[PDB]
Design a protein around this ligand. Structure first.
Ligand SMILES: Nc1ncnc2c1ncn2[C@@H]1O[C@H](COP(=O)(O)OP(=O)(O)O)[C@@H](O)[C@H]1O
Ligand SMILES: Nc1ncnc2c1ncn2[C@@H]1O[C@H](COP(=O)(O)OP(=O)(O)O)[C@@H](O)[C@H]1O
Ligand SMILES: [Mg+2]
Ligand SMILES: [Mg+2]
Lengths: 7, 372, 743, 139
């Protein structure tokens, strides 16, 4: 992703 | 007439084929490999890349990236190779001549749709494109117009309640627990038995174990006590080199994490309790219909017994009178592709495509505006 | 604007579609005083006007001076009843009305008499059109075909019989035709059905190519079939029947050969049972099949294959009795032993357990693996019926091949003349997917007809000097676009077959939403959601949506075909299949594609046309009923053709024939041996302007009514001179009486 | 008409009186006019007679004085030639066609009248020189 997770 | 293409960017597989077929004409892991060692033999062949079944065959020599993580495309440069390989090698088709249909998880970052379009029109020059919610396509796949679809991929799990062909977007839940996190947990617990799997090529060796020998406990505490009480659960497996490895209760302990993400250390509840808490968000009128039409979808729901474990569990949350039914067609891994094949061949849909002309006028923002 | 005392006019009536009057007050400008034997009849925001008795009975319906439905119906009535003439022409179209008694007319010496002569030279007869076909094929290597069209029982098959007999006697020098006629019992037995209005209606379209050598001797004939009504096999509206062969077979169950076929009575089997009407009056099917079996025996199909055919049809009847128990919303099954599957598997020699599985489940196989699913009881029932329809349609396409093997000849076919027998445009008091297909094929055929007639008139005018623009034509393409094109009625019908849950109720809503006020030609019946109304070229037709989808749907599960193809008991069952994307295609798209295979065959060819119309419903010999015949003649597009011709310059006179008839108008002042320039001078006196006539090279063309104008002024001059002559004769004769008395 | 004409016409009229009352029937008035050189149409004859009804036409008798205004009213070749040239160009006319038209069109005559007027004017082919026949019937 961009925040709460690695992607 | 020119038939549309139907393509599904899973995390774990690419599935592609021609609309109107009842199965994909290509499936292969959406995996990109690069050589890491030194090339000793001058005059041997040389490649900067392998894709799919190639990167599978040689994997001992390669580092394997997935360009997709939790359904977000994490680098485009490899993804564009995966699409290029899909159209030119797997389907052997010019994309200039066929509409294309592309498939996406419900919440994922809105920038993803813009880039995923921009590459279809700039790189492949596709005539026409559309992007469709995986759970919607699962309904077309399973012959229904009302249901709640639980869909779980290699990279994402999500629920989407749909009633009478209206989707119900306030009631939509997304847990990114998936095949890959079941793999990584499987590695961590396998370490307990004195095996370690350390590398990308080796992680797929784990995954083949997960696919062959995992199953879901119909009571967790019963079978856990049983395996301690006797080894009848225990089964064993041959690594590529011929080493045997042997696995007990531990093969169910991974499927149980879907029902207790406390093992992985997630906050949120198992997918039964998300499914229920999704239905509760729905209007009380509809719920009697969503309880009957529970549809399993995607490969992470292929584990033997997940259907019964779901039914026995959600039948404990739901009020005693309601009829609870769970619907698990044995092709469900394909079903998102099948339902996309059905959708792409409807005549009403032909008005829906994003045209190259209208993208060229409107710019990639069009994909949010038109598509849903 | 002519009406006088002693004018005559046609008026509408409830009982005969038109009735004549004489007008007995001179009209000038609001109501007319008419005698019949009195009425005053209203004018409204003019009445039709009637041809002088010299015209009525004239041998070409375009010869008349006033063209309209009353005059046409009158001419056909008087020719049929009074002169016992069954044949009449309109424009190029021959129009044929079945005498429904035998007649002398078809004998050999008439066949010989017609040969060699043009369509103006002789009174109309079917031989005259066949002789036109033969004469065009003699001018041009271009193939010719003959198209025979009308309501069921109007006499299409008999008109084909005679049209082929013409070639057989004139060309033939020795035995194709005796084989062709021996083919009729077989193709009727497999291909004819009993329908609400009459029995023995042909549910397909049949094309015979008579082949010629390079001296136009008949070498051999090739038969093609199109547009088969496959849906009738498994479904039947009330008081109809499926194809005769099934009843003949059931009626024959007592015979010892059939005894192994374990047949019932004809209302036992679920396919034959549905219509509720086993028996046709005055046909004993048990002694029909003796005919059809002899037809096979003569036409070269062995007793081995005949017993194969009946073994397959008994297989289908036994297949239909298979009944499925449910287990589930999503699973069904077959009870522990089910007798109509036990018998069926013995008849076609396959494993009961394998059919039990593959009937019940279906298989789907990807790049990697094979998956086997239960299916709901409704899908299993649709699959069973799609299988029965596929077995039937392949047995049909096989019997037509083993016929052609008897009818081909190895010599090269230099050219062919083709004869086509096809159901006519048809409108009923319920309409259903079959009628929608029939009316779509008729819309196509009369597009080809309109374009052909418009071409032939563009050719004729350019044989003259005259500008084309006066010509125009009825283009019916927007109805074909409504029926056939994408987002058309058939396309949205297949879409409901694709869509996850589909019903005629939900279909019709799509129809309305898309067409209802987007298109001039699609309409909703004011007081139903369930039906829709199409403005077909002839007349508005109302189609009910209910049970389109069940009729629309075929999909054969490939593994069900494979279980049959694995059979080894007898040789015919493998042979039928032996010879996918095809298997998916719905009935409404196999019909489309077979209609293209037809229209591309005809569009390679030059058409000639025969229209059949049926005088009366009740089988009364050689009477006539107005109320049907007007509907038939609208269904034939004859009325539209006539109205178009009346808009143009319908009448033709050759300068010689005009001068000869109208010399009475002229004077010795005004005759000069160059006939054309004399008539050019005279006509401008008599009729004001070219706006009413054109000078051709060899003919004069008139707008409607100028012929009646000529006959009016001629008859006036004729009476004026006649009475002058009588008056003068009596003057001198009375002077003779004055001499008689005074002497 | 002068006194001499009136006297000759009255004498002729009285010669046609077959009942002795000095009168003829209305239906004979036209015949007398034609015998006296008039050529009225049947319509003209009925008009000068006053379009009489059947009963008075068949039984009502009128003397000369009432007849005279009618004769006056009636009194107050190239057309004949063109009329015959309609049905012709060798100067002949078929006997059959003239017979048919005279017995079936116009003021239809009896077969005996047509035979009588045509008698002696047709040749072996059955053709009449119509200029001579016209002069003959106008004499
Ligand atoms: N038969 C099976 N049993 C258990 N797990 C499976 C099975 N097939 C696939 N999986 C796992 O599920 C994931 C693939 O699911 P899939 O629906 O193909 O993903 P995607 O969303 O990319 O299509 C992978 O983690 C794979 O290991
Ligand atoms: N020209 C004809 N002479 C004698 N009988 C005729 C003629 N035309 C039609 N009929 C009668 O009408 C019947 C019905 O017409 P037919 O051609 O057999 O059916 P269809 O018109 O459906 O092909 C014929 O069997 C025959 O008895
Ligand atoms: Mg998926
Ligand atoms: Mg017939």
């Amino acid at each position: 992703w961009x925040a709460x997770c690695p992607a | 007439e020119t038939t549309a293409l139907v393509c599904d960017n899973g995390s774990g597989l690419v599935k592609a084929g021609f609309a109107g077929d009842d199965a994909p004409r290509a499936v292969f892991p959406s995996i990109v490999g690069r050589p890491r060692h030194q090339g000793v033999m001058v005059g041997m062949g040389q490649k900067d890349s392998y894709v799919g079944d190639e990167a599978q065959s040689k994997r001992g020599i390669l580092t394997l990236k997935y360009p997709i993580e939790h359904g977000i495309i994490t680098n485009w440069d490899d993804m564009e190779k995966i699409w290029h390989h899909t159209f030119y090698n797997e389907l052997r088709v010019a994309p200039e001549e066929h509409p294309t249909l592309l498939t996406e998880a419900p919440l994922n970052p809105k920038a993803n749709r813009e880039k995923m379009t921009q590459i279809m029109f700039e790189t492949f020059n596709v005539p026409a494109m559309y992007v469709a919610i995986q759970a919607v396509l699962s309904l077309y796949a399973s012959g229904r117009t009302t249901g709640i679809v639980l869909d779980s991929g290699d990279g994402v799990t999500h629920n989407v309640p749909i009633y009478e062909g209206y989707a119900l977007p306030h009631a939509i839940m997304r847990l990114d627990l998936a095949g890959r996190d079941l793999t990584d947990y499987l590695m961590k617990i396998l370490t307990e038995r004195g095996y370690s799997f350390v590398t990308t090529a080796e992680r797929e060796i784990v995954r083949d174990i997960k696919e062959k020998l995992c199953y879901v406990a119909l009571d967790f505490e019963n079978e856990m006590a049983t395996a301690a009480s006797s080894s009848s659960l225990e089964k064993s497996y041959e690594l590529p080199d011929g080493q045997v490895i042997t696995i007990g209760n531990e093969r169910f302990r991974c499927p149980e994490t879907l029902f207790q993400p406390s093992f992985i250390g997630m906050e949120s509840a198992g997918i039964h309790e998300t499914t229920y808490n999704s239905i509760m968000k729905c209007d009380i009128d509809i719920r009697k219909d969503l309880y009957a039409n529970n549809v399993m979808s995607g490969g992470t729901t292929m584990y033997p017994g997940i259907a019964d474990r779901m039914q026995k569990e959600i039948t404990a949350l739901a009020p005693s009178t309601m009829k609870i039914k769970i619907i698990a067609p044995p092709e469900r891994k394909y079903s998102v592709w099948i339902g996309g094949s059905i959708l792409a061949s409807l005549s009403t849909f032909q008005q829906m495509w994003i045209t190259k002309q209208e993208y060229d006028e409107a710019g990639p923002s069009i994909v949010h505006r038109k598509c849903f | 604007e002519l009406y006088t005392k002693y004018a005559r006019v046609w008026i509408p009536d409830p009982e005969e579609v038109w009735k004549s009057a004489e007008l007995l007050k001179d009209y000038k400008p609001k109501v007319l005083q008419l005698r019949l034997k009195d009425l005053e009849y209203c004018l409204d925001p003019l009445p039709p006007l009637r041809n002088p008795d010299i015209l009525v009975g004239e041998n070409d319906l375009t010869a008349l001076s006033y063209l309209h439905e009353p005059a046409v119906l009158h001419n056909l009535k008087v020719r049929f009843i009074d002169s016992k003439l069954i044949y009449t022409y309109c424009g190029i179209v021959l129009v044929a009305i079945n005498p429904y008694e035998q007649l002398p007319i078809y004998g050999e010496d008439i066949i010989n008499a017609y040969s060699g002569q043009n369509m103006g030279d002789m009174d109309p007869h079917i031989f005259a059109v066949a002789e036109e076909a033969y004469k065009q094929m003699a001018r041009d290597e271009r193939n010719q075909s003959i198209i025979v069209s009308g309501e069921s029982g109007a006499g299409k098959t008999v008109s084909a019989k005679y049209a082929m007999r013409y070639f057989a006697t004139v060309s033939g020098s020795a035995n194709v035709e005796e084989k062709v006629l021996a083919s009729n019992p077989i193709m009727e037995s497999i291909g004819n059905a009993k329908t609400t209005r009459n029995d023995n209606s042909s549910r397909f379209g049949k094309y015979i190519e008579i082949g010629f050598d390079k001296r136009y001797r008949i070498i051999g004939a090739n038969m093609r079939t199109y547009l088969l009504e496959k849906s009738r096999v498994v479904f039947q509206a009330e008081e109809e029947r499926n194809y005769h062969i099934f009843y003949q077979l059931c009626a024959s169950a007592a015979l010892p050969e059939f005894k192994t076929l374990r047949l019932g009575n004809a209302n036992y089997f679920h396919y034959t049972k549905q219509g509720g009407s086993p028996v046709i009056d005055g046909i004993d099917d048990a002694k029909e099949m003796v005919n059809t079996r002899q037809a096979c025996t003569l036409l070269g199909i062995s007793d081995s294959y005949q017993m194969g055919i009946f073994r397959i049809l008994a297989g289908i009847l036994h297949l239909g009795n298979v009944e499925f128990a449910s287990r589930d919303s999503d699973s069904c099954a077959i009870p522990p032993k089910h007798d109509p599957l036990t018998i069926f598997c013995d008849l076609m020699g396959v494993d009961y357990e394998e059919m039990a599985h593959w009937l019940c489940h279906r298989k789907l196989a990807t790049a990697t693996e094979t998956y086997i699913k239960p299916i709901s009881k409704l899908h299993a029932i649709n699959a069973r019926d799609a299988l029965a329809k596929h077995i039937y349609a392949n047995l049909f396409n096989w019997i037509v091949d083993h016929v052609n093997k008897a009818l081909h000849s190895t010599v090269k076919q230099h050219s062919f003349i083709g004869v086509l027998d096809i159901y006519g445009f048809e409108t009923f008091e319920i309409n259903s997917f079959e009628q929608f297909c029939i009316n779509y094929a008729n819309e196509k055929l009369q597009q080809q007809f309109n374009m052909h007639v418009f071409k032939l008139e563009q050719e004729e005018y350019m044989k003259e000097q005259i500008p084309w623009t006066l010509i125009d034509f009825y283009d019916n393409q927007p109805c074909i676009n409504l029926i056939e094109a994408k987002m058309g009625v058939l396309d949205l019908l297949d879409e409901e077959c694709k869509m996850p849950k589909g019903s005629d109720d939900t279909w019709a809503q799509k129809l309305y939403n898309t067409h209802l006020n987007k298109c001039a030609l699609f309409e909703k019946p004011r007081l139903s959601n369930k039906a829709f109304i199409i403005k077909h070229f002839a007349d508005k037709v109302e189609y009910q949506c209910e049970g389109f989808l069940e009729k629309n749907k075929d999909t054969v599960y490939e593994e069900q075909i494979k279980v049959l193809k694995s059979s080894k008991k007898f040789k015919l069952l493998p042979e039928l299949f032996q010879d996918s994307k095809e298997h998916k295609k719905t009935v409404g798209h196999q019909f489309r594609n077979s209609l293209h295979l037809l229209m591309e065959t005809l569009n390679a060819t030059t058409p000639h046309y025969v229209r059949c119309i049926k005088p009366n419903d009740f089988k009364f010999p050689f009477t006539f009923d107005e109320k049907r015949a007007v509907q038939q003649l609208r269904a034939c597009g004859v009325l539209e053709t006539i109205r178009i011709s009346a808009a143009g310059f319908p009448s033709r006179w050759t300068y010689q024939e005009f001068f000869s008839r109208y010399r009475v108008l002229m004077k010795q002042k005004d005759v000069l041996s160059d006939r054309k320039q004399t008539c050019k001078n005279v006509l401008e006196k008599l009729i004001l302007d070219k706006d009413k006539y054109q000078f051709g090279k060899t003919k004069i063309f008139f707008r409607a009514g100028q012929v009646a104008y000529l006959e009016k002024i001629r008859a006036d001059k004729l009476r004026a001179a006649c009475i002058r002559i009588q008056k003068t004769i009596r003057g001198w004769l009375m002077r003779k009486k004055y001499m008689r008395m005074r002497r | 008409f002068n006194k001499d004409q009136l006297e000759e016409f009255k004498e002729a009229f009285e010669l046609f009186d077959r009942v002795g009352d000095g009168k003829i029937l209305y239906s004979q008035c036209g015949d007398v006019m034609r015998a006296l050189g008039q050529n009225p149409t049947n319509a003209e004859v009925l008009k000068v007679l006053g379009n009489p009804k059947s009963d008075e036409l068949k039984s009502r008798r009128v003397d000369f004085e009432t007849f005279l205004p009618m004769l006056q009213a009636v009194a107050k070749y190239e057309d004949y030639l063109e009329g015959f040239r309609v049905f012709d160009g060798n100067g002949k006319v078929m006997g059959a066609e003239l017979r048919h038209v005279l017995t079936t069109l116009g003021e239809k005559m009896t077969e005996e009248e047509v035979e009588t007027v045509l008698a002696g004017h047709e040749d072996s082919n059955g053709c009449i020189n119509y200029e001579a026949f016209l002069k003959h019937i106008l004499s």
